[PDB]
Amino acid sequence: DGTGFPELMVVMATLASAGQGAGHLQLHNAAVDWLSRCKKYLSQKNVVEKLNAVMILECTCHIMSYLADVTNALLCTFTITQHWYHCHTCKMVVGVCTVCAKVCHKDHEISYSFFCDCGAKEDGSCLALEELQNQANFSFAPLVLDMLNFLMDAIQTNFQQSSRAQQALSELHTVEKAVEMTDQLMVPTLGSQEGAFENVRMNYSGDQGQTIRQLISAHVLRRVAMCVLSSPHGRRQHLAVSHEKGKITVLQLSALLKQADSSKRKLTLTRLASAPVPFTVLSLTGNPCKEDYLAVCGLKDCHVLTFSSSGSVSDHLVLHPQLATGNFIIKAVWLPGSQTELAIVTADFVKIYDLCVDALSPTFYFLLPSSKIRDVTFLFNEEGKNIIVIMSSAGYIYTQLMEEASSAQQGPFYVTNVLEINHEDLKDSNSQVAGGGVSVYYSHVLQMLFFSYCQGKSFAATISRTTLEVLQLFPINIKSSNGGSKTSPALCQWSEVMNHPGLVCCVQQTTGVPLVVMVKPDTFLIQEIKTLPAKAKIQDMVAIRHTACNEQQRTTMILLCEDGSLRIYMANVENTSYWLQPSLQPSSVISIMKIDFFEHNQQLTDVEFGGNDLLQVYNAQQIKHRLNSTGMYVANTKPGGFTIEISNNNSTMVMTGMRIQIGTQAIERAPSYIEIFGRTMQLNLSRSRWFDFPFTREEALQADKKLNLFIGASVDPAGVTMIDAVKIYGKTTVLERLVVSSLEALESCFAKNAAQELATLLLSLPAPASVQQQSKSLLASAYHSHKDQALLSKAVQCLNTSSKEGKDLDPEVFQRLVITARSIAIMRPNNLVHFTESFITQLVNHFWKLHASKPKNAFLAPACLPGLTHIEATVNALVDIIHGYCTCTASKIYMQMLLCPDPAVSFSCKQALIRVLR
């Protein structure tokens, strides 16, 4: 009876607590017997096979956890005679020079033609001149050991339930895919009311407008109204939206993406400065490598806009596609892993521009032998060269390597190489493969080519990037839930959600209903995104993976409806997290390792002194005048003091500091304190004097054109507070529970060679970032010696085995070894050198081997990630280890690391060696 067994077990534990306070072996023995009985049942190998294909297993886990808890319980200018200063502490207001202020009056009250009086002084003042535990440790601990041992086969099976990611990718490429329809990939969370965006419906009209309508109706052109501008490198999550007025609006998404859990709150999209384009905007394309760049295309025009951090247009570049007679710009494509390479695709040609070199002349100029261009995608071969793939209107897929031979230096280049694909659905008729071609897309992350035809035939294929041959072909069949729609809709607008491998988006060419596809190594999960009501025809969709308030990289899909409403869908983590599982993700512990102020400033002019508490009594000019006039001052009877608002009207200057003069009229009417940038400064003055306040680099950025100065109340019984002057200065699972319980129990019992060997096996055995943490806790002078010996001996064994079988050490395994060694190189470098003893050389050799396999570009990198997750951190760690050895070939290794063309390698090495010297 698994149901109820854990609640009864918790009542048993509470009664044990009773006897624990006062009693003799209250529940300790019975609980040992319960562990024995749970082992007896599981030992049923028939039940083990059933689990491989559960209540008793949960009972065992609970008993083990309880047992673990039980075991746990068991010179001066005078030298020469300038910027002079008053020392209030020494009552010199007489003055001191800059040096004397910092030397003879160091830590004194100091306020910014003269002769230092400090030095003038000949006094020499100027220096600038129980039974339960016994039973648990009697035979219970061995009992647990033998239990885990005979259950180890089943335990290894449950553990199974970079290398894995490679295997999964391999399966993805080789194993047949089942197509399943689901409604659980994306779940609706938030939606805006009708009209949130005014004028999003582009009412095309007039000669050019009629042409556009005809082209959209003929499915030759499609409008892309929304684009997300959030590069992985950048942090400016933003949304660009085009409007019927041909105006581009940039919105801030950070507020919207955080209100994901908001039960009943209006969608919030902060508007930024817009973007000016003198044409009807048909497509928006952001640069994934640089989130500031936006390509804006009309029918014949292509503009590249650069946005500042505030969302305003900083730069505007206009391209010249030189379209043929009757030709038009279909779209603009930023070449993968590039910031300047921009391809312009037309029905007649494809021109590729390097915008860093030349915006007028294309670097590449491609033409087809016949037919028209319906889609163009770019792939990077194992060599690293871009290979253009072109879908023709006739249904042929053309491929061409981008090299000097195919360059536009000699004029237009005719692409003749056709990717050969043979399928029963692919029967070319009247020179039209399955009715002709529609769309082509290559996923670098999945290393798969997606393409679709006019007759609703869509395929995913694995291609050899060297030979450009199709290796495996997988059909994507969409079954319309609505009856009578036997004909399959054609697919278009293929895209992958950035930083969410396997989640692919596309749209039916005719219907225009977005589809979300989760690609797994044996299955295509497909969800059709419907509208409630359908009246809100979906105009465009954008998917983005963002950091949630819980730091969860949630994948949000934003839909723009024709009526101007926004609808937001969220990815269901259970159905969309296959490639994001820590088992497939390259989880790495290395990640955890990873007074003269006013002399150089100038008093600002035209600064607006407009404190609201003073605005009611004095006019703006008066305030300025009084604060900048002697004998004149500003007063305020408001209890608690008042706020002065300072506005910098000079956009070329930054406020870096402020000086305030107080006490000239009456000391009792001087403010007691001031608050600026959240800092409270006490004003302890006995005579009229100035107070200096510099602004920190960060505060200088905060006080660029606006500054709020809070003035505290004076000690005047009448409540009068006075300021004499203000000067501004500036410059220009069940398995999880089971393993947790067992390993906690083992660690408590241990609190040794065989125990270490058991943990070592558990370490080698697979884990989804769980058993590892458990084995970590299991492991947590004689002690340090044993511990260090065991870890280093294993590290040496792992490095030797990898060297002998000629196999590159697993990046994660390698990084674990490096961290372990590093920790010891710090705790006991002597132990590090003695136990390991060749070791340093092996580490460094493997580092270079893994570094050489490191992916050239993250976007191009596939689901499996070779190389090292954190080279910098790794380099830092290696330097600590090498240094630890030297304290108790290495120099050559240091020189090699410093020279590495890869900058971070040497720069981090630089930092590591500074720390070792420090």
């Binding site: 030297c886 304290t887 290495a890 120099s891 050559k892 240091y894 020189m895 410093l898 020279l899 590495c900 063309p901 900058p903 040497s906 720069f907 090495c909 630089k910 060696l913 500074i914 010297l917």
Partner: protein, 194 residues
């Protein structure tokens, strides 16, 4: 620990010929490491003093004071960038010869600066600097360290000619200041042409 850091610096300078066309920017970290090691080659200890003198001799062999390729010195080159790195290292070395918060460190720092200046003068480096300066002046007529890292965050030599000019404005100036502080070493002689 001090002795092992010293032998590490020795092996570094021994493989140092390899650093030539590697690129000064890629080698910023290496010369900065050399500095960190030197920040300990102080005291009145003469073993450390001779290690520092051997470093200075390596830097002089690198420096082209003897070479009369003043034109090639004007033309930005790997060698020119390496010479600029050597000058920046020498400046960092002589720039910490102050007496502020120095527990007998002033005595060591002073000795280091004096030795550096003497070695530089013994190689007629001042004459070579005058030559490169006349060359850059002719270039102007034709036209008619970590501090740099902070100032120039891009970490690109940028205007090497300006850096080369600025670096000589510094190295010989430091030489003259040191030859005045240490009377034992004579200050460089400048004639009307200088």
């Amino acid at each position: 620990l001090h002795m092992v850091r010293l032998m590490l610096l020795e092996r570094l300078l021994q493989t140092l010929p390899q650093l030539r066309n590697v690129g000064g920017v890629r080698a910023i970290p290496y010369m900065q490491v050399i500095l960190m090691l030197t920040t300990d080659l102080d005291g009145e200890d003469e073993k450390d003093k001779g290690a520092l003198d051997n470093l200075l001799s390596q830097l002089i062999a690198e420096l082209g004071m003897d070479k009369k390729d003043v034109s090639k010195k004007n033309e930005r080159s790997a060698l020119n960038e390496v010479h600029l790195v050597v000058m920046r290292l020498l400046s960092v070395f002589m720039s910490r010869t102050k007496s502020g918060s120095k527990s007998s460190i002033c005595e060591s720092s002073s000795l280091i600066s004096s030795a550096t200046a003497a070695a530089l003068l013994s190689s007629g480096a001042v004459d070579y600097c005058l030559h490169v300066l006349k060359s850059l002046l002719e270039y102007w007529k034709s036209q008619q360290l970590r501090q740099y890292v902070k100032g120039h965050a891009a970490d690109v030599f940028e205007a090497y000619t300006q850096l080369l000019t600025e670096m000589v404005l510094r190295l010989p100036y430091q030489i003259k200041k040191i030859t005045d502080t240490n009377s034992r070493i004579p200050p460089p002689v400048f004639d009307h042409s200088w």
